[PDB]
Design a binder for these strands. Structure first.
Lengths: 45, 115, 143, 101
RNA sequence: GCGACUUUCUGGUCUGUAACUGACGCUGAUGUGCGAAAGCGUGGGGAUCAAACAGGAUUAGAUACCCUGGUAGUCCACGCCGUAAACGAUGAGUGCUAAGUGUUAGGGGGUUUCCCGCCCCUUAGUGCUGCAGCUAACGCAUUAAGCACUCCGCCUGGGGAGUACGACCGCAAGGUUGAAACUCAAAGGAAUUGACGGGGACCCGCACAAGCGGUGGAGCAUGUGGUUUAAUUCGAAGCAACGCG
């Protein structure tokens, strides 16, 4: 393993799931209508 | 003075802090290092360099007993969790893996609101 | 935007000495600045019998930092400082730390100072350090 | 502070009155080095009441202005302008910190 | 309004079939029933989140915005009120009115060795663009705000006020129905120029950065205000007046 990719690979499998947006989305609460609209206003970005 | 050379690590780089705890195979506590316990505060804990001296310390203090190989486990979404491990590899260890972790609920409950 | 060459110094066939004169050349009176400087040569080239260029290149390299910082609210960043500004830096901390010695004559404090940092002493080696202390204390919150 | 007024001789009740009512604003922030006032009278033939003033600032200055029938109502206007001015100028500003990388 | 899984019950929808009855339909006053969230009640239940609130910080001040905890509630049943930007700010039913474009459930057709690749047509639903035509303009445009018909509800300047009295309902908060006095000469919609911005983007500038030098600091000339005078002759005042006229 040594070094180099060890930090890049992990970063790759970590970038796939997207931990950032998954629990950042649940960082502060929202209404259901608002959330729905938000999700709608986007699908292929 | 429990000694092996393949322990395991649990990590957490919060928005406001980034800390360490090194445990054994099962495991159980041996040491930890608070960025705040290194004089820092505030956001000064949240900076990556705080985790350098911390993880260096509890890595060092833990290989006092003697530990080189290890496995790693990282929740705590924040900055330090990719720089201070480039300080970790300099710490005297032989990392065998690094496993992501994060608590995913399944629409469980409420967070706060403001702002 | 470029930077106002000196041809050479026609003393030593050097360049650096003129770059320093122009910081000492108060009132444009090079006659008196090159006066007090030539005095500086014979004096320091007497004490600890040597050359200028030895104590000069020595002591100018002993105070000269390789880092300093800058703000940008204001967050203070570490940077490898660029070389000519690093030159005029060593020059400036040198002379501006020099005159505050509480010493009468044009030159004795100067040679005292370059001889100071020649042995890794003096407050300009000290400020070099504190620059190199803030720097690497300045890596956390800014790098 | 600087008070020159044409076609009229100033008095003293207006001084304590106006300058005290200006002093009320050290809520924010006063900061009271200069306060230049300015007046004149001007036949129309309804024929005037000029009420003009600077209230300069740290690193900047200002202007409030008014013309009236009368100095009391006409003055309550050199004040209840500067108030809103000084207030904003302090709000402002920008702190909502936010780490980076 | 309805998004873990399964089963039990269970209504409704679209296709083609058209063989069955043979105009049996449409609307719908009065009426009766469902009905977000809050909320009241009887109890239960109570992990998070949380009005009220306790405390902390900030602000001149802040009962607020921010942090920590924190009750009612948020949750289940049984009930009750029955309202809303309950908005596609568009009543329902029918029939005609240019194309193109995805997309959903289905049908039929062709294409390929067999369509699994493909296309054609069609039915219902679904969104985007876009002609006539309409519209004060914005926009609409086969799911019309077009063209015409049947029925229902509504409106007649604004403030007064959906307030008041009265009546009905409701445990109560309140709901529904819904005035007039007096007052005004407008209220208002759409669209344009400019102004503003504690909105955004781009650029320039001794505006920055960088550095050097300066003032204020002590003594001298001088303009102003304040003083005073019999006179201190008169004017101009942020930059743009105070070594000026």
């Amino acid at each position: 393993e040594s070094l180099e990719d060890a930090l890049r690979r992990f970063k790759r499998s970590v970038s796939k799931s997207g931990t950032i947006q998954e629990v950042r989305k649940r960082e502060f609460y929202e209404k259901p209508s608002v959330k729905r609209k938000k999700k709608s206003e986007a699908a292929r970005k | 003075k429990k000694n092996i050379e393949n322990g395991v690590a649990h990590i957490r780089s919060t928005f406001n802090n980034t800390i360490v705890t090194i445990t054994d195979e099962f495991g159980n506590a041996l040491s930890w290092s608070s960025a705040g316990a290194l004089g820092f505060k505030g956001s000064k804990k949240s900076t990556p360099f705080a985790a350098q001296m911390a993880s260096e310390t509890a890595s060092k203090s833990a290989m006092e007993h003697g530990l080189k190989t290890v496995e790693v486990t990282v929740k705590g979404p924040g900055p330090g969790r990719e720089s201070a491990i480039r300080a970790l590899q300099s710490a005297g260890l032989e990392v065998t893996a690094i496993r992501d972790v994060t608590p995913v609920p399944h629409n469980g409950c409420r967070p706060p609101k403001r702002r | 935007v470029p930077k106002r060459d000196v041809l050479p110094d026609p003393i030593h066939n050097s360049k650096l000495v003129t770059k320093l004169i122009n910081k000492i050349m108060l009132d444009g009176k090079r006659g008196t600045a090159q006066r007090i400087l030539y005095s500086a040569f014979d004096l320091v080239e007497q004490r600890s019998g040597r050359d200028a260029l030895e104590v000069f290149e020595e002591a100018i390299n002993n105070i000269m930092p390789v880092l300093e910082v800058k703000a940008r609210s204001n967050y203070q960043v570490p940077v490898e400082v660029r070389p000519e500004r690093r030159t005029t830096l060593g020059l400036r901390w040198l002379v501006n730390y020099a005159r505050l010695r509480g010493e009468k004559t044009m030159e004795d404090r100067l040679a005292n100072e370059i001889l100071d940092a020649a042995n890794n002493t003096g407050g300009a080696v000290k400020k070099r350090e504190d620059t190199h202390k803030m720097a690497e204390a300045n890596k956390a919150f800014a790098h | 502070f600087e008070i020159h007024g044409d076609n009229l001789t100033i008095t003293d009740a207006i001084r304590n009155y106006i300058e005290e009512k200006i002093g009320k604003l050290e809520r924010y922030f006063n900061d009271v080095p200069n306060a230049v006032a300015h007046v004149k009278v001007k036949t129309y033939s309804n024929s005037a009441t000029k009420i003009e003033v600077t209230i300069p600032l740290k690193n900047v200055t200002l202007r409030a202005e008014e013309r009236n029938d009368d100095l009391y109502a006409g003055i309550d206007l050199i004040n209840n302008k500067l108030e809103r001015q000084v207030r904003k100028y302090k709000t402002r500003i920008n702190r909502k910190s936010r780490d980076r990388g």
